[PDB]
Ligand binder design. Structure first.
Ligand SMILES: COc1cc2ncnc(Nc3ccc(F)c(Cl)c3)c2cc1OCCCN1CCOCC1
Ligand code: NA
Length: 297
């Protein structure tokens, strides 16, 4: 019986003249640039993302990204209507967390790993409060603002649940199989609890310092592996306490898996005694970051 409330997010349309590209970051192509609005004496570092069937997907993505506002989720600064539609967002200078953990494998300690798990769970809990199923959570879709501050991005697959709707039922469409809950593979059902499965895989990627899950197994074999009860193995650095959390994320009964709000509590506790839980060897004047550039709502 609960109804739906209005979404009064403001979609800001940026003029192409207001921002300068600088370099490519990966060709979907994403550029790094500088946005210099109105007559404001500020310069904001941005990332800039860019056949009729595809502009619909980029506008669904802009819709979601314009509707989120949390320190651990990436939000839209605005869109630019060129030949192709561009999404403009805060530059996350250290890039994606997957690459970051691979590049700094030898220097990442237990405090960082556990704090990232907390922050990812915070962002995901926020998305859950907004009734959004992300559907593509993975370390490649977490971005690094600084080593101490990460945010979830890439809302290309995300879906808004009705006020009294548990599930999104997908049609066909490519979905990254190695991060998907078993029920999503077999039945195309997605929920907040399927996102929790992906979260566990994401934690595993972190705790192996960026290993590929089920490395060298074809995606078409993953369903039958999971059905037999096999799961990703215990990373070497992980105590049983940390692995148990991961394993719980990969239970067959979706409602048995932890909730994001529980994951925040559990990883917060572990971050206070990090070496109890992970055993790890060797443990421009007018530039404004977009977190200090506030746009009325
Ligand atoms: C400094 O690097 C980035 C900062 C970023 N800052 C903000 N957003 C990014 N991506 C992004 C993601 C979704 C969006 F809607 C928009 Cl507008 C942008 C960013 C992507 C970035 O790089 C993506 C790097 C992808 N690597 C680069 C090549 O190696 C494999 C994948
Ligand atoms: Na230690």
């Amino acid at each position: 019986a609960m109804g739906e409330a209005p979404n009064q997010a403001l979609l800001r349309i940026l003029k192409e003249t207001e921002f300068k590209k600088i370099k490519v970051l990966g060709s979907g192509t994403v550029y790094k640039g500088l946005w210099i609005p109105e007559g404001e004496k500020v310069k904001i570092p941005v990332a800039i993302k860019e056949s009729p069937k595809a502009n619909k997907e980029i506008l669904d993505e802009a819709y979601v990204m314009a509707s989120v506002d949390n320190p651990h989720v990436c939000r839209l600064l605005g869109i630019c209507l060129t030949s192709t539609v561009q999404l403009i967002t805060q530059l996350m200078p250290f890039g994606c967390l997957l690459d970051y953990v691979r590049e700094h494998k030898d220097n990442i300690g237990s405090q960082y790993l556990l704090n990232w798990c907390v922050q990812i769970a915070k962002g995901m809990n926020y998305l859950e409060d907004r009734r959004l199923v992300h559907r593509d959570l993975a370390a490649r879709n977490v971005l690094v603002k600084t080593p101490q501050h990460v945010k979830i991005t890439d809302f290309g697959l995300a879906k808004l649940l009705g006020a009294e709707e548990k599930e999104y039922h997908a049609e066909g469409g490519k979905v990254p199989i190695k991060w998907m809950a078993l029920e999503s593979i077999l039945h195309r059902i997605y929920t907040h609890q399927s996102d929790v499965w992906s979260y566990g895989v994401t934690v595993w990627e972190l705790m192996t310092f960026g290993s590929k899950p089920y490395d060298g197994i074809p995606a078409s074999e993953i369903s039958s592996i999971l059905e037999k009860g096999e799961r990703l193995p215990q990373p070497p650095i992980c105590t049983i306490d940390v692995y148990m959390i991961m394993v719980k994320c990969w239970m067959i009964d979706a409602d048995s898996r932890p909730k994001f709000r529980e994951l925040i509590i559990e990883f917060s506790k572990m971050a206070r005694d990090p070496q109890r839980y992970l055993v790890i060897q060797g443990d421009m004047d007018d530039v404004v970051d977009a977190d200090e550039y506030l746009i009325p709502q």
